[PDB]
């Protein structure tokens, strides 16, 4: 029988299941064209039990839903008689704690009901909305959400009207209400074309007798608000009142969800409504400020943020109305103990601060700096820090700022975790106290110093950190005793052996020396830097970073204080930082070679760099060649070019290549500046482009590339023409590196010299007798064409027209 | 030459209603100045429409010895932050730059 | 030569490139098409031609895009 | 071997062995612009990997200033797959 | 075969030089072009720049 | 600015140093000269007369009498190879066209 | 030598224009493009004087310019396709009086190439996606979503690479929250270059086609080709969605056509000419530019023709189909690079050579002793009409422009000491010799 046969040949789902990706291509293509002729008749019965098989995997599911959707697009009609079957076997997936079961059932049902018939759907799944089981009601309701995804709400909305206006069953009114909230979850923005039709659907049950329907409808309000935020400035008064009354004449998860939903209604309202509505809802809020519930807390606090954050309600309103119960019931240990409440309580309390100031909020959360759950005072400084950092320290008065600074000190000592929490709190709080902090610098430091004395490393390290934070304001005190303190006491801790603390100590010393210059530093740098030199041997990325930073500052500014001989020894030590395994170190090393060339003259450091070029192993040769480029950039290139060029004569490879690579970087650093040394360097590149070796011409070509890109636009085009004459012959080459550097030289030279000159070099060998030469010229002309295909329009030759074609361009020789 | 006693000039008049002048330089101090002005301006204030300025002015054959007065004259309409940054690279004050910008049109054109 | 898979992918990527055997006909016809696409793109050569002949911008661009089809004679053989 | 299926807005990343070099130029210096990759060499187990090592995406692949002067950085996901 | 037919399809250097409008160019590299009329018109265009010497040679560039 | 019209596209011009006096040469593609303009107008009016039906219905007068200014109404000029010219002698300081030489058909 | 380059007078000629509320208000702004310049003007309704608010350099070529509004926002972004391999998104800050770059997407190489996108660019009427397109082998599409904070985002682009195909235009079709989709023209030079006879040069047909989104499956699928009778330049979009039907007016030579896919039987109409004209027996007629006034009440198109004549077009439509077409002679204004038909009762006629104009609309172009034309009126013969001076439009404003500056001469040819400039400018009948001077009158 042809039907059993069609299924037989149809099981090339084996071709797609097992097999090569060739197998996949053969079968996928054949069926994607046979999707009519094969049909869905045999498919669906082969197909449903694999899609329901217990361990078909993520991408098996992905591929099979690919199949179902595209074959259902294909066979809009040729899938017809299997609708209730697909329906009921996939249905529980939309109402299912796997978001992706929801998603995938949703998408395939979208396409199913889409290329299918709505009639069948309605027919089968009307009588199930009235059913007795909330299980089946939820499953069919989230199904209906997926079916609206598949077809569109419009075709359905009156039948929704029915399933929601039913006077037989409350079961079915609850069902329709959750269908509502479900689409409100799924399609999201896609509702505003209706935007009130569903609101009409739901107006019936927030007053209903069954708490189930009432409160799921509250949550429907929540979900619709959520998808219905921002855009939606129009129609909304036609339902404002059932919301209003159910808010109080209701109880449940729905009410907190509805508070978030009416948060969307507090942003979208006007005074004579957003005064009465808010003012009314605030007493709801005051009774909910003690709500244990989590998503309650979320919804009510989000609400409050927008609600008591409008211009409808005066500061007085909140300060006498919201704050007392709000602070009372949310400023218990429970909320900081909570993982959600910590941050969200923060959010809304910072916003109420933004609303009504600091001289009351700060006062209401002062002594939570001395509570028990260190998490708590941690939270309160998290807030306070955010608050004063955004707003300023001007609002806080005297006694307030006192108790604040003191609770701060406590939090930081009491610290028992390795966290940036209390650090950032401190940094922000003094960052905002600005100049308010003068009189407690004895207090603040004395604390930090006693900590710096501790046995266990961790607290020592912490105190070093805290110094590195407040370092700048330590200045704004003008604390003679106190900034002097931090200076000498950190000179003490310079003996640490925990790299993690030593690095931060170096950071704090640097950030002190920035404010207070060298010649009034508390340890005179005359004793500091001698102490620092034995640290440069600490073979650790963070302490090394900060140490070389500090020594670079000093050698820049102090320069004359240190002696030439010291700088020379330090040069010789840098020469073997160029082999660290971390690249930050090596870039810092090169920079300081630059600074030393500025302080001392360039010539001795350049002599010590060439001798390093003689080393082998490449990555310290390459980094000394960077350093040479840098020395030349700072102290003008005429000082170094003769020595480089002359060193190009020592007969060794690694060094001739070092010279060439260094000129590369130099012209890149110089850029336009190379417009000076281009003439000096040409006769050396022409020298090395007339053969000396493969690598000789590879390297001279790289140099030409970088010179050209530097001297773009400064007129030194005669020199690059001259060097084209010498580079272009290497065009026929084979070695990959050699021909590659040649091609690079020709792109650089293309921007710098223009595309006429290079199209002329490329003219004659486009159509030449050999295929090796045809191919190289078409490679070049391709790269000349891709970049700057639009200049060439005025550079093409004149190519006469034979009999049956026209080839001249008369457009271009109209006279005028 | 346009205005009386103004040094010589090249007037160019395009096909889209544009009219302008190319004006020589008398001192590598002027030259190097605007040279650096725009060499920074390209880097920190690129054109709106995606392009690169160097490549737009070297569309067909590369640039050679012309500075883009219409990019330089954009320093005015720039933002205080960047106005700072660049004039500090020049270590002149935004007054120094903007006056040296305006006066070079002053002595040639209007 | 996987470089070549990529490189005749590049030939497939950029209409107008070449290779060592390319024929005067492909070369000059590609440059001719590009010339047309830019006469259209640049708002001003369009005025140049519109004004040179006595046509109007719709007339101009219609001609151009008709010509874009066999601009340089019939093919090679 | 290259992906080169055209560019996007998804940044690339470097393992720590591969930390520091440019993607093609094989430099170690003066990186200017960030790398972007294609969706196809963006998805799945290939999220946040080393364009070169294949190792875990930790540090950001960048573009040597030469590569940006010659605009070899305007071709797209250069993943050696 | 195909190669023999197109080799015979090829012409004399005198064939070329007499055909062409600018005879200075003609060389046997052109006489060996698969499109010598083009190749010669190109090589006789203005301002264009001829292939290096050394593609024939067996020695590499500056050995 | 202040703008003194022309009727054919301006190609080039030269100066008269004696009287400050400007000789413009103007010329256009795709246009009939003055002569052929009027001549084929009235001639089309003739072939228009010949509808053979009421003879009475006369529009030719209104044809030769209408003159819709091309300055707004587009230029009644057509063909493909059809050229037109003018030389004009004008004053820069005021827009008098003190002389107008108006040339042949396709010259 | 060492030179410094200065522009005294910017380029004046106009190439592109858009109209939108580019400052969020319902006072409308106009954004036109000079050569390498983006210039924004706001027309005051009181006097009728347009103030040129913001004139900016972009250092590139503006090949394509199209404004768009996000679904429900109050601003009017700009999408600019220029000659770099990028699409750019622009906005106005009146607070700083400056254009602001929201997003930036590279997709290829620089210069006015041939297969790199940027020449044509269209949007979807609602503001959901943009398509960028070249004149061969390449088109991409970008999707646009407000972010949580409603600050626009743009994801990676789609593809429609189809070899050997021109494009004479691309345009977005107005669907109602379906998948957006686009109507391009096309052609296929392919065979005409396989045929050694030149036969396939003739006998090749434009194919008015639609590509379609699938935002669910996130790709572009080729829906609907249809071989068109004859090549026509472009496609005016029909205000669909809720208002109007969907569909395109194909502006082909001598004939303007309604057409939409599905059940509609395709609608024709020959173009009415002016009578007793003096134009070559051969010369065809093409629709040059268009502009559509779609308002609370209804919609209509204006399209212009070579001799400068403007026409009105509205749709005589039954339930889902339209039924027939009425083009009725409005008036004739300078030849236009663009029309931007305001509310507040004007329209911007961007001249193409010379001074560009602002007209104000006086009568809807309906119900007077000017005849009536139609797509249902059968005939053996054509229509005609006899034009006349300005009836339905009144010339409010006149902005000067030198475009084109065909010749110059510096001299001091008035008795004044400072030199004047003698600019020979303008095209054909609208040409002139014009005196420039440094003074103000
Ligand atoms: Zn690189
Ligand atoms: Zn990839
Ligand atoms: Zn790696």
Swiss-Prot record, chain A:
Main location per the UniProt record: nucleus
Name of the protein in question: Splicing factor 3B subunit 1
Interaction with SF3B3 and SF3B5: region residues: 760-816
Gene Ontology BP annotations: chromatin remodeling; mRNA splicing, via spliceosome; positive regulation of transcription by RNA polymerase I; positive regulation of transcription by RNA polymerase II; positive regulation of transcription by RNA polymerase III; RNA splicing; RNA splicing, via transesterification reactions; spliceosomal complex assembly
Family indicated by similarity: Belongs to the SF3B1 family.
Record's GO cellular component terms: B-WICH complex; catalytic step 2 spliceosome; nuclear speck; nucleolus; nucleoplasm; nucleus; spliceosomal complex; U11/U12 snRNP
Marked site positions, Interaction with SF3B3: 114, 189, 717
Biological function: Component of the 17S U2 SnRNP complex of the spliceosome, a large ribonucleoprotein complex that removes introns from transcribed pre-mRNAs. The 17S U2 SnRNP complex (1) directly participates in early spliceosome assembly and (2) mediates recognition of the intron branch site during pre-mRNA splicing by promoting the selection of the pre-mRNA branch-site adenosine, the nucleophile for the first step of splicing.
Keywords: Acetylation, Citrullination, Isopeptide bond, mRNA processing, mRNA splicing, Nucleus, Phosphoprotein, Repeat, RNA-binding, Spliceosome, Ubl conjugation
Region (Interaction with SF3B14): 41-80
List of residues that carry N6-acetyllysine: 66, 74
Site-annotated residues for Interaction with PHF5A: 104
Keyword match Kinase: no
Site (Interaction with RNA): 99, 547, 561, 653
UniProtKB/Swiss-Prot annotation, chain B:
Site (Interaction with SF3B1): 64
Domain of life: Eukaryota
Positions of the UniProt region annotated as Interaction with SF3B5: 1-16
Positions carrying Phosphothreonine: 93
Subcellular location: Nucleus
Role according to the record: Component of the 17S U2 SnRNP complex of the spliceosome, a large ribonucleoprotein complex that removes introns from transcribed pre-mRNAs. The 17S U2 SnRNP complex (1) directly participates in early spliceosome assembly and (2) mediates recognition of the intron branch site during pre-mRNA splicing by promoting the selection of the pre-mRNA branch-site adenosine, the nucleophile for the first step of splicing.
Protein name: Splicing factor 3B subunit 3
Curated annotation (Swiss-Prot), chain C:
GO molecular function per UniProt: RNA binding; splicing factor binding
Residue ranges of the region described as Interaction with SF3B1 and SF3B3: 11-72
GO CC annotation terms, alphabetical: nucleoplasm; nucleus; precatalytic spliceosome; SAGA complex; spliceosomal complex; U12-type spliceosomal complex; U2 snRNP; U2-type precatalytic spliceosome
InterPro entries for the chain: SF3b5/RDS3-10, Splicing_factor_3B_subunit_5
A Pfam family per the record: SF3b10
Residues flagged as site, Interaction with RNA: 1, 16
Family: Belongs to the SF3B5 family.
Protein name: Splicing factor 3B subunit 5
Species the sequence originates in: Homo sapiens
Curated annotation (Swiss-Prot), chain D:
Annotated localization: Nucleus; Nucleus speckle
UniProt keyword Cytoplasm present: no
Keyword field contains Phosphoprotein: yes
Domain of life where this protein originates: Eukaryota
BP terms from Gene Ontology: mRNA splicing, via spliceosome; positive regulation of DNA-templated transcription; stem cell differentiation; U2-type prespliceosome assembly
Region ranges (Interaction with SF3B1 and SF3B3): 27-43
GO cellular component terms given for this protein: nuclear matrix; nuclear speck; nucleoplasm; nucleus; precatalytic spliceosome; spliceosomal complex; U12-type spliceosomal complex; U2 snRNP
Molecular-function GO terms, alphabetical: DNA binding; RNA binding; zinc ion binding
Protein keywords: Acetylation, Activator, DNA-binding, Metal-binding, mRNA processing, mRNA splicing, Nucleus, Phosphoprotein, RNA-binding, Spliceosome, Transcription, Transcription regulation, Zinc
Positions annotated to bind Zn(2+) 1: 3, 38, 41, 77
Binding residues annotated for Zn(2+) 3, in chain numbering: 22, 25, 64, 67
Binding site for Zn(2+) 2: 15, 18, 50, 53
Region ranges (Interaction with SF3B3): 71-74
Function: Component of the 17S U2 SnRNP complex of the spliceosome, a large ribonucleoprotein complex that removes introns from transcribed pre-mRNAs. The 17S U2 SnRNP complex (1) directly participates in early spliceosome assembly and (2) mediates recognition of the intron branch site during pre-mRNA splicing by promoting the selection of the pre-mRNA branch-site adenosine, the nucleophile for the first step of splicing.
Family stated for the protein in its record: Belongs to the PHF5 family.
Protein name per its UniProtKB record: PHD finger-like domain-containing protein 5A
Native species: Homo sapiens (Human)
């Amino acid at each position: 029988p042809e039907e059993q046969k069609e299924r037989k040949i149809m099981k090339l789902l084996l071709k797609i299941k097992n097999g090569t990706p060739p197998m996949r291509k053969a079968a996928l293509r054949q069926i994607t064209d046979k999707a009519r002729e094969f049909g869905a008749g045999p498919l669906f019965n082969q197909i449903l039990p694999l899609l329901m098989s217990p361990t078909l995997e993520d991408q098996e599911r992905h591929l099979l839903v690919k199949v179902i959707d595209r074959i259902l697009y294909k066979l809009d009609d040729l899938v017809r008689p299997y609708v209730h079957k697909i329906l009921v076997v996939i249905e529980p997936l939309l109402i299912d704690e796997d978001y992706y079961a929801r998603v995938e059932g949703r998408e395939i049902i979208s396409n199913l009901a889409k290329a299918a018939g709505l009639a069948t759907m309605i027919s089968t799944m009307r009588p199930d909305i009235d059913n007795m089981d909330e299980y089946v009601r939820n499953t069919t309701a989230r199904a209906f959400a997926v079916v609206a995804s598949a077809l569109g709400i419009p075709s359905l909305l009156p039948f929704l009207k029915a399933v929601c206006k039913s006077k037989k069953s409350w079961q079915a009114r609850h069902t329709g209400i959750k269908i509502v909230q479900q689409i409100a979850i799924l399609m999201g923005c896609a509702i505003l074309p209706h935007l009130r039709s569903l609101v009409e659907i739901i107006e019936h049950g927030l007053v209903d007798e069954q708490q189930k329907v009432r409160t799921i409808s509250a949550l429907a309000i929540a979900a619709l608000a959520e998808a219905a935020t921002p855009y939606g400035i129009e129609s909304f008064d036609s339902v404002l009142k059932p919301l209003w009354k159910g808010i109080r004449q209701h109880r449940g998860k729905g009410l907190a969800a509805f508070l978030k939903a009416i948060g969307y209604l507090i942003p979208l309202m006007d005074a004579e409504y957003a005064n009465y509505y808010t003012r009314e809802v605030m007493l709801i809020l005051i009774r909910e400020f003690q709500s244990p519930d989590e998503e309650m807390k979320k919804i009510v606090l989000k609400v409050v943020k927008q609600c008591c954050g409008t211009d409808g309600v005066e500061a007085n309103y909140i300060k006498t109305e919201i704050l007392p119960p709000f602070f009372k019931h949310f400023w218990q240990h429970r909320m900081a103990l909570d993982r959600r409440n910590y941050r969200q309580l923060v959010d809304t309390t910072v916003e109420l601060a933004n609303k009504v100031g600091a001289a009351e909020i700060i006062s209401r959360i002062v002594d939570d700096l001395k509570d028990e759950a260190e998490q708590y005072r941690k939270m309160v400084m998290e807030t306070i820090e955010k608050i004063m950092g955004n707003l300023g320290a001007a609002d806080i008065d005297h006694k307030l700022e006192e108790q604040l600074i003191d609770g701060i000190l406590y939090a930081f000592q009491e610290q028992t975790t390795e966290d940036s929490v209390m650090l950032n709190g401190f940094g922000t709080v003094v960052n905002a106290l600005g100049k308010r902090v003068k009189p407690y610098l004895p207090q603040i430091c004395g604390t930090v110093l006693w900590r710096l004395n501790n046995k266990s490393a961790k607290v020592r390290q912490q105190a070093a950190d805290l110094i590195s934070r407040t370092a700048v304001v330590m200045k704004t005190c003008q604390e003679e005793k106190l900034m002097g303190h931090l200076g000498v006491v950190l000179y003490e801790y310079l003996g640490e052996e925990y790299p993690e603390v030593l690095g931060s100590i170096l950071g704090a010393l640097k950030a002190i020396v920035n404010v207070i210059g060298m010649h009034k530093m508390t340890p005179p740098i005359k004793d500091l830097l001698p102490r620092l030199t034995p640290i440069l041997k600490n073979r650790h990325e963070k302490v090394q970073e900060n140490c070389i930073d500090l020594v670079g500052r000093i050698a820049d500014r102090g320069a004359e204080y240190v002696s030439a001989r010291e700088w020379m020894r330090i040069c010789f030590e840098l020469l073997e930082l160029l082999k660290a395994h971390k690249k930050a170190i090596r870039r810092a090393t090169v920079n300081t070679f630059g600074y030393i060339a500025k302080a001392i003259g360039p010539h001795d450091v350049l002599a010590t760099l060439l001798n390093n070029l003689k080393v082998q192993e490449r990555q310290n040769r390459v980094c000394t060649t960077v350093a040479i480029a840098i020395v030349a950039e700072t102290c003008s290139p005429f000082t170094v070019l003769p020595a480089l060029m002359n060193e190009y004569r020592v007969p060794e490879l690694n060094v001739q290549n070092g010279v060439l690579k260094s000129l590369s970087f130099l012209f890149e650093y110089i850029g336009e500046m190379g417009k000076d040394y281009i003439y000096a360097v040409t006769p050396l590149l022409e020298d090395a482009l007339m053969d000396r070796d493969l690598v000789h011409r590879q390297t001279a070509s790289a140099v030409v590339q970088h010179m050209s890109l530097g001297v773009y636009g400064f007129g030194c085009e005669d020199s690059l023409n001259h060097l084209l004459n010498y580079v272009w012959p290497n065009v026929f080459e084979t070695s990959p590196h050699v021909i590659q550097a040649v091609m690079g030289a020709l792109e650089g030279l293309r921007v710098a010299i223009g595309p006429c000159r290079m199209l002329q070099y490329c003219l004659q060998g486009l159509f030449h007798p050999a295929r090796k030469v045809r191919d190289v010229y078409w490679k070049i002309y391709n790269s000349i064409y891709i970049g700057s295909q639009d200049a060439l329009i005025a550079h093409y030759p004149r190519i006469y027209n034979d009999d049956k074609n026209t080839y001249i361009r008369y457009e271009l020789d109209y006279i005028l | 030459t346009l205005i009386p006693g103004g040094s010589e000039s090249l007037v160019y008049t395009t096909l889209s209603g544009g009219i302008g002048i190319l004006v020589p330089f008398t001192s590598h101090e002027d030259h190097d100045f605007f040279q650096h002005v725009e060499m920074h301006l390209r880097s920190e204030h690129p054109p709106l429409c995606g392009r690169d300025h160097l490549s737009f002015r070297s569309y067909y054959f590369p640039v050679k010895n012309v500075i883009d007065g219409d990019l330089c004259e954009q320093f005015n309409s720039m933002e205080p932050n960047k106005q700072k940054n660049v004039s500090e690279e020049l270590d002149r004050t935004p007054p120094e730059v903007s006056k040296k910008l305006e006066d070079i049109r002053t002595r040639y054109a209007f | 030569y996987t470089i070549h898979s990529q490189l005749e992918h590049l030939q497939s990527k950029y209409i107008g490139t070449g290779h060592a055997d390319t024929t005067k006909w492909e070369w000059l016809v590609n440059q001719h098409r590009d010339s047309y696409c830019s006469y259209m793109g640049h708002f001003d050569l369009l005025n140049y031609f519109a004004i040179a002949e006595n046509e109007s911008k719709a007339r101009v661009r219609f001609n151009l895009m008709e010509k874009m089809l066999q601009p340089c004679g019939p093919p090679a053989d | 071997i290259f992906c080169r299926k055209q560019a996007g807005v998804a940044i690339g990343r470097l393992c720590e062995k591969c930390d520091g070099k440019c993607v093609i130029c094989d430099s170690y210096v003066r990186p200017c612009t960030l790398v972007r990759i294609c969706d196809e060499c963006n998805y799945g187990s290939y999220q946040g990997r080393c364009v070169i090592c294949g190792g875990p995406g930790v540090s950001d692949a960048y573009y040597c200033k030469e590569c940006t002067i010659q605009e070899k950085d305007r071709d797209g996901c250069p993943k050696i797959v | 075969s195909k190669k023999k037919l197109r080799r015979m399809n090829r012409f004399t250097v005198a064939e070329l030089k007499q055909l062409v409008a600018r005879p200075d160019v003609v060389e046997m590299h052109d006489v060996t072009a698969q499109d010598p009329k083009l190749l010669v018109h190109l090589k006789a265009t203005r301002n264009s720049v001829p292939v290096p010497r050394h593609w024939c040679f067996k020695r590499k560039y500056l050995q | 600015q202040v703008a003194f019209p022309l009727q054919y596209t301006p190609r080039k011009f030269v100066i008269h140093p004696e009287s400050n006096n400007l000789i413009i040469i103007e010329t256009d593609h795709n246009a009939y000269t003055e002569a052929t303009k009027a001549q084929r107008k009235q001639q089309m009016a003739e072939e228009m007369v010949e509808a053979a039906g009421e003879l009475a219905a006369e529009m030719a007068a209104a044809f030769l009498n209408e003159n819709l200014p091309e300055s707004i109404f587009g230029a009644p000029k057509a063909g493909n190879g059809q050229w037109a010219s003018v030389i004009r002698v004008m004053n820069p300081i005021q827009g008098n066209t003190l002389d107008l030489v108006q040339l042949e058909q396709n010259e | 030598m060492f030179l410094y380059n200065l522009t005294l007078q910017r380029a004046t000629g106009i190439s592109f224009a858009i109209h939108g509320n580019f400052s969020g208000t319902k006072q409308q702004e106009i954004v036109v493009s000079r050569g390498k310049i983006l210039e924004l003007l706001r027309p005051d309704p009181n006097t009728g004087k347009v103030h040129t608010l913001l004139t900016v350099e972009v250092f590139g070529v503006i090949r394509s310019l199209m404004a768009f509004r996000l679904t429900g926002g109050t601003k009017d972004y700009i999408v600019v396709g220029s000659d770099s391999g990028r699409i750019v998104i622009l906005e106005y800050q009146p607070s700083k009086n400056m254009f602001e770059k929201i997003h930036q997407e590279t997709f290829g190489k620089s210069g006015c190439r041939r297969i790199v996108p940027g020449q044509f660019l269209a949007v979807d009427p609602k503001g959901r996606a943009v398509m960028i397109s070249a004149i061969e082998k390449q088109k991409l599409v970008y999707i646009l979503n407000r972010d949580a904070a409603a600050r626009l985002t743009i994801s990676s682009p789609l593809e429609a690479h189809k070899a050997n195909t021109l494009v004479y235009h691309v345009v977005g079709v107005d669907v109602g929250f379906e998948n957006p989709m686009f109507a391009c023209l096309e052609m296929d030079y392919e065979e005409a270059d396989n045929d050694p006879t030149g036969e396939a040069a003739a006998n090749t047909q434009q194919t008015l086609t639609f590509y379609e989104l699938d935002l669910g499956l996130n790709h572009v699928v080729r829906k609907y080709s249809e071989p068109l009778e004859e090549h026509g330049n472009f496609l005016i979009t029909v205000p669909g969605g809720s208002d109007g039907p969907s569909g395109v007016l194909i502006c082909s030579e001598n004939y303007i056509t309604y057409k939409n896919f599905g059940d509609q039987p395709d609608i024709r109409c020959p173009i009415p000419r002016r009578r007793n004209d003096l134009d070559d027996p051969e010369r065809g007629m093409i629709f040059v530019c268009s502009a559509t006034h779609k308002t609370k009440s209804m919609f209509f198109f204006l399209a212009q023709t070579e001799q400068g004549d403007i026409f009105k077009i509205t749709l005589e439509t039954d339930e889902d189909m339209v039924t027939e077409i009425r083009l009725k002679y409005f008036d004739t204004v300078p030849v236009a690079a663009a029309m931007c038909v305001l509310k507040t009762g004007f329209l911007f006629v961007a001249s193409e050579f010379g001074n560009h104009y602002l007209y104000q609309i006086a009568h809807l172009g309906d119900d007077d002793e000017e005849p009536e034309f139609s797509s249902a009126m059968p005939l053996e013969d054509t229509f005609f009409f006899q034009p006349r001076p300005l009836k339905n439009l009144v010339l409010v404003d006149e902005l000067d422009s030198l475009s084109p500056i065909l010749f110059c001469q510096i001299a001091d040819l008035a008795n004044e000491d400072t030199p004047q400039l003698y600019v020979a400018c303008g095209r054909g009948p609208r040409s002139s010799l014009r005196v420039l001077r440094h003074g103000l009158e």
